[PDB]
């Protein structure tokens, strides 16, 4: 079981409407666990998972201070980038960052992340070697040469290999149980027809966590990849997810098709068919 601790940060300039909007969201194994939002009179880092309420006021105070420090730095960065791209001060612009660490089941670093984007596009990223940067355009080359000269990469490598890992281990101790939770899908097949010689069988999976799941339809042995309609997995809004997969089949041949639901909360994959009770 590998694990990760990552922070997703957003700064959006709002010329004429106030100060930039600033957001930090922290994730342990892709599960949101803290959040800072600048849109408040006294913005504070907040717990987003009940197992984080164990942390004392010192922790929260320090996180809040850092967030406020990052907010100011991003306010400067937004201005710098207007210059690099020679853009007007009247436009809204976005800087995004993904920063953090994933470690193996042994607790050691597998990957360090530090990726920046400007207006939804790659700007600059720390390579997997944790020593060099990839710049995506001419503007990012300025940042790159600056950071190389000042040896920023090695300072950042230290944080990622040390502090990041250490905090991840701490957060896992308090939240591991919660993070390992699984809700298995309840599945069923619905049947739809307009006045025509075909029908639609829709295989549904509901109330499941985590989001990762696979649905297939089988005719005979073979899976029907090309013919299926699929929707993206989506939140029910209560912490669980939904998905469905559907196939158009000949009228009267419903019982030749089988739906399969694969999910880690299932001891064995579910198999099911259209089943009219009357």
């Amino acid at each position: 079981g590998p694990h990760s601790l990552r922070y997703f940060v957003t700064a959006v300039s709002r010329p004429g409407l106030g100060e930039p909007r600033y957001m930090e969201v922290g994730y342990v194994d892709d599960t949101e666990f803290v959040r800072f939002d600048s849109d408040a009179e006294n913005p504070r880092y907040e717990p987003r998972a009940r197992w984080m309420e164990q942390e004392g006021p010192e922790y929260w105070e320090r996180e809040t201070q850092k967030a406020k420090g990052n907010e100011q730095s991003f306010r400067v960065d937004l201005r710098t980038l207007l210059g690099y791209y020679n853009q007007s001060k009247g436009g809204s612009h976005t800087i995004q960052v993904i920063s953090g660490c994933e470690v193996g089941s042994d607790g050691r670093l597998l990957r360090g992340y530090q990726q920046y984007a400007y207006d939804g596009c790659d700007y600059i990223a720390l390579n997997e070697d944790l020593k060099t940067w990839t710049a995506a355009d001419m503007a990012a080359l300025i940042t790159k040469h600056k950071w190389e000269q000042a040896g920023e990469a090695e300072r950042l490598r230290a944080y990622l290999e040390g502090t990041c890992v250490e905090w991840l281990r701490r957060y896992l101790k308090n939240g591991n149980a919660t993070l390992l939770r699984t809700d298995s899908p309840k599945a069923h097949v619905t049947h739809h027809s307009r006045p025509e010689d075909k029908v639609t069988l829709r295989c549904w999976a509901l109330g499941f966590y985590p989001a990762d799941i696979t649905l297939t339809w089988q005719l005979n042995g073979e899976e029907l990849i090309q013919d299926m309609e699929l929707v993206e997995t989506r939140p029910a809004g209560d912490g669980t997810f939904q998905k469905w997969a559907s196939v158009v089949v000949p009228l009267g041949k419903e019982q030749y098709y089988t739906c399969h639901v694969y999910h880690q909360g299932l001891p064995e994959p579910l198999t099911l068919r259209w089943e009219p009770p009357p």
Partner: peptide, 9 residues
């Protein structure tokens, strides 16, 4: 640990 103090772009 967020953390703070990233270098300027």
């Amino acid at each position: 640990f967020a953390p703070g103090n990233y270098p300027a772009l």
